Amino acid sequence: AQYEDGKQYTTLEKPVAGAPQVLEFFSFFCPHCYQFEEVLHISDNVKKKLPEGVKMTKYHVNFMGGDLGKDLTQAWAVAMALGVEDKVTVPLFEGVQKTQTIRSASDIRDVFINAGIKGEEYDAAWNSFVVKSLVAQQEKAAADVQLRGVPAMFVNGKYQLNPQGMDTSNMDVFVQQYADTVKYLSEK
Numbered sequence: 806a807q808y809e810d811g812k813q814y815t816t817l818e819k820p821v822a823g824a825p826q827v828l829e830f831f832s833f834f835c836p837h838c839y840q841f842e843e844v845l846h847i848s849d850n851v852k853k854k855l856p857e858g859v860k861m862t863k864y865h866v867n868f869m870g871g872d873l874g875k876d877l878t879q880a881w882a883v884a885m886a887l888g889v890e891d892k893v894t895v896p897l898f899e900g901v902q903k904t905q906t907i908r909s910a911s912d913i914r915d916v917f918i919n920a921g922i923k924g925e926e927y928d929a930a931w932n933s934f935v936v937k938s939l940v941a942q943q944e945k946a947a948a949d950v951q952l953r954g955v956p957a958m959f960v961n962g963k964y965q966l967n968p969q970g971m972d973t974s975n976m977d978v979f980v981q982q983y984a985d986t987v988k989y990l991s992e993k
């Protein structure tokens with residue numbers, strides 16, 4: 806078998822029902838997550854290898870960064886509620902890891918302000934029960950698979966990507982193996 810459990814992916818002991826087709830977990834504090842987003846563009850290359858109907862879901866996690874870690878998960882909920890993931894992902898990553906200018910909830914907000922989101926919209930979304938729910942959903946999804954590491958990707962609540970079984974001498978080969986794997990799992 807060219808794909809085998811334990812190599813390119815692992816299988817969940819207890820599967821999760823009702824999960825999204827493709828589910829990614831990441832942390833703006835997470836060094837490999839910065840690489841998947843800015844250097845390797847994992848999500849985008851996965852997306853391009855799937856049918857157009859497949860739903861990709863990406864969630865932030867709490868277990869890195871203490872207080873800011875949770876602030877970031879609420880802010881990611883704001884980003885999803887407002888639909889501006891594509892406007893704030895890069896500045897969030899660089900604020901936390903490149904310039905290290907994100908050191909409080911107020912600096913996170915600055916990112917959205919600079920990115921074009923009006924102060925009133927941000928604060929209204931930040932404090933909304935819609936966002937509280939989106940925070941709960943992110944947490945719940947993570948809880949379902951006892952997530953202790955990011956970046957992580959799960960396919961149909963049953964399969965987890967195992968980047969440790971993939972060649973890393975070449976960034977492009979590595980993301981294609983990763984993307985081709987997601988496609989193979991999406992079809993099991």
Ligand SMILES: COc1ccc(-c2oc3cc(-c4cccc(OC)c4)ccc3c2CC(=O)O)cc1
Pocket residue numbers: 837840841844845954955956957968969970973974975976977979
């Ligand atoms: C859930 O926990 C985990 C999450 C991710 C990893 C992981 O992240 C990785 C990133 C890269 C990389 C990134 C940017 C350029 C680049 O150059 C080609 C290579 C390469 C390999 C890995 C691995 C696997 C391993 O460590 O063997 C491990 C554990």
